[PDB]
Amino acid sequence: EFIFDSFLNELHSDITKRGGSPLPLPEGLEECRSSKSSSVIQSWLWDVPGFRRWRVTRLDAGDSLQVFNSVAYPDYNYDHPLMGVDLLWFGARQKLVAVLDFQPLVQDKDYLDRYFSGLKELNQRFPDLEETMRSFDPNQYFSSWLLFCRGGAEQADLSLPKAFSAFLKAYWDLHDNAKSIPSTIPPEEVKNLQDKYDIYSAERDPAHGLFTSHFGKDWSNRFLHEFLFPASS
Ligand SMILES: C=CC1=C(C)/C(=C/c2[nH]c(/C=C3N=C(/C=C4\NC(=O)C(C)=C4C=C)C(C)=C\3CCC(=O)O)c(CCC(=O)O)c2C)NC1=O
């Protein structure tokens, strides 16, 4: 809970330091409170220089659930990976699900070579963070060097905090190193590929059940298709 808050504030502080400013969300999607769960989900959009979209979501459902999630979409003139962060803590089962990746637009060797030196290094530094995916395809819109942990309190408390900060710093470094460097994928196709990221991710959505339980079918669907993965229908 406090750990997840610190991630949100670091990200928001970083965004602010970098000249980012808040953007309005579709009405009703910025906050939803569970009529049953005592669960609260809050979301943000940012105008971050170099990025055409940047969303953040924080779900506070006490000891039942904590979530911190964020996706960064670079401006179309950058073909570099998206940032994807999906962190869940299930208090009843003392269960951590932590996924952090630089989600690649393509799997081409040259593209992976170009962008992944930092993530490769992070992956080596935080080995406690082997897991198999049951919904997503590890070869579509994920890299080989993602941090993917299904674990417990030790991982959540001891490794995740420093790993998140390192991951975030490595993502900014990635973006900054891409400034003024030729993109190999041009803007029209970066757009197609980012939109197809939304389409893919909405198709494989592992969260609809959790969302529906807390917030109802209608809100969950709006949230998925209007905020999470806006190019999806
Ligand atoms: C507020 C938004 C949001 C929430 C709360 C969320 C929840 C959510 N994400 C999950 C899995 C997952 N989530 C990810 C990864 C990601 N998923 C992403 O949305 C992004 C950007 C990444 C980036 C790395 C992966 C790899 C899994 C495992 C699913 C699988 O087994 O295929 C799961 C299943 C837990 C499990 O695998 O045991 C839940 C309930 N997903 C969301 O999008």
UniProtKB/Swiss-Prot annotation:
Alphabetically sorted, this entry's keywords are: Oxidoreductase
Q: What is its EC number?
A: 1.3.7.2
The catalytic activity, as recorded, is: 15,16-dihydrobiliverdin + oxidized 2[4Fe-4S]-[ferredoxin] = biliverdin IXalpha + reduced 2[4Fe-4S]-[ferredoxin] + 2 H(+)
List the InterPro entries hit by this protein, alphabetically: DiHydbiliverdin_OxRdtase, Ferredoxin-dep_bilin_Rdtase
The kind of enzyme this is, by top-level EC class, is oxidoreductase
* Family note: Belongs to the HY2 family.
Protein purpose: Catalyzes the two-electron reduction of biliverdin IX-alpha at the C15 methine bridge.
The name of this protein is: 15,16-dihydrobiliverdin:ferredoxin oxidoreductase
Give the species. Answer: Synechococcus sp. (strain WH8020)
